[PDB]
Amino acid sequence: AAQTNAPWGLARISSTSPGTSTYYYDESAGQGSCVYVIDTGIEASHPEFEGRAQMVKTYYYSSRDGNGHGTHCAGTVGSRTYGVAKKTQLFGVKVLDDNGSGQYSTIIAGMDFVASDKNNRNCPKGVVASLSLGGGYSSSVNSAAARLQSSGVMVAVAAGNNNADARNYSPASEPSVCTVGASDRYDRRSSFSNYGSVLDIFGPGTDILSTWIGGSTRSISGTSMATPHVAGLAAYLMTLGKTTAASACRYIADTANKGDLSNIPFGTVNLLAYNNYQA
Numbered sequence: 257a258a259q260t261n262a263p264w265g266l267a268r269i270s271s272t273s274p275g276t277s278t279y280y281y282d283e284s285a286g287q288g289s290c291v292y293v294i295d296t297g298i299e300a301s302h303p304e305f306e307g308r309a310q311m312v313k314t315y316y317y318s319s320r321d322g323n324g325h326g327t328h329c330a331g332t333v334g335s336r337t338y339g340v341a342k343k344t345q346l347f348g349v350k351v352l353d354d355n356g357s358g359q360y361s362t363i364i365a366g367m368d369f370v371a372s373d374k375n376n377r378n379c380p381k382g383v384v385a386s387l388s389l390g391g392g393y394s395s396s397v398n399s400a401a402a403r404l405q406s407s408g409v410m411v412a413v414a415a416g417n418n419n420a421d422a423r424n425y426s427p428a429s430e431p432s433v434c435t436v437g438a439s440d441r442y443d444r445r446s447s448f449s450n451y452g453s454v455l456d457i458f459g460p461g462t463d464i465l466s467t468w469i470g471g472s473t474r475s476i477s478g479t480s481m482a483t484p485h486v487a488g489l490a491a492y493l494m495t496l497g498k499t500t501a502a503s504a505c506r507y508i509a510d511t512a513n514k515g516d517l518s519n520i521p522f523g524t525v526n527l528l529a530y531n532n533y534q535a
């Protein structure tokens with residue numbers, strides 16, 4: 257399938273070169289997979305989600321996304337226009353308040369919730385979790401992410417926006433999950449993206465158009481935007497039968513576009529997420 261005039265990041269993930277604008281992908285489109293978006297919530301009523309999104313859990317007075325961040329990330333995973341995996345099922349878990357903040361204890365509870373809740377959902381092709389959040393190093397936060405991964409969920413986490421080594425941030429520093437840095441449309445490391453040996457992969461993260469609250473759209477930047485590209489890619493590849501939740505991060509790294517990014521510090525992977533789709 258070909259989506260013309262796609263957001264640059266979608267075009268990038270199906271291309272051997274920057275500077276194109278059509279996204280190419282197998283029409284299976286993540287059908288039969290599920291992606292949990294652990295964030296500020298999801299505006300599931302947005303027409304872009306086509307009834308495929310729903311809120312499954314909140315720790316606050318509402319499950320609504322009063323911020324926009326979670327809706328934007330969910331749109332990059334799976335919206336019809338802005339999403340990588342256009343037929344996946346999206347499940348929102350609201351661990352962050354409407355200012356975008358959340359206690360680590362609530363975030364940990366949300367990860368353990370997903371590890372159990374997947375057994376209440378129909379996801380024959382596999383389960384992914386996208387975590388566009390983080391703070392300073394916490395062994396307990398890392399262990400929660402490791403449990404979620406161990407339970408059979410492909411966990412993708414943001415590297416962070418500190419222009420620093422991600423080893424000092426959580427869950428970015430957990431080795432067993434997929435830690436995602438951000439790149440721009442010219443194949444440069446995004447200026448804010450964390451780096452370091454703990455990164456597994458880069459995805460598009462600067463000037464990413466996606467869904468927003470109030471039935472709207474907007475373009476924003478962050479490792480929060482790169483992470484759902486990778487989460488959606490994992491769901492897409494799992495539906496295709498090319499990999500599993502346990503191995504999807506390593507498969508994405510093995511099949512990535514290699515050596516094409518600039519301003520990557522010595523010792524950080526130079527790997528850009530790529531679907532290897534041959535139309």
Ligand SMILES: Cc1nc(N)sc1-c1nccn1C
Nearest residue numbers: 419445451518519520521522
């Ligand atoms: C973080 C970084 N980005 C580059 N293009 S070089 C570089 C770096 N190497 C060693 C230290 N730093 C700060």
